[PDB]
């Protein structure tokens, strides 16, 4: 068992005050559409090294 | 002079043939890449010949 688990570091509740203090506790708390993607809005240079590390990066990165 | 020229391989014409040869033989003698088709061509995001089509292409002079 390695989950982080609830610790109670002062005092000692009687079960009462167990069970009402996790009830309240218990109580309170990737498709992708590249469409028009900003990078496909902006306007790159024809030699542009961000094609690579920025566009298609983007692209493909999945 | 390193100009080709003319030769007359055979035979030798008067001055006035030559004149008439040379008359007659005289007498018978910006970019603009806008839609150019690789810009028209589909590409993956991936493919190389947005390097050696494309760009090879639009900055070639």
Not at 26 to 42: C, F, I, Q, T
């Amino acid at each position: 068992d390695h989950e982080a688990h609830i610790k109670v570091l002062r005092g000692e509740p009687t079960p009462e005050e167990m069970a009402a203090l996790m009830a309240v506790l218990a109580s309170a708390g990737k498709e992708r559409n590249m469409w028009g993607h900003p990078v496909d809005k902006l306007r790159y240079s024809v030699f542009s090294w961000q094609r690579v590390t920025l566009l298609e990066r983007t692209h493909m990165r999945r």
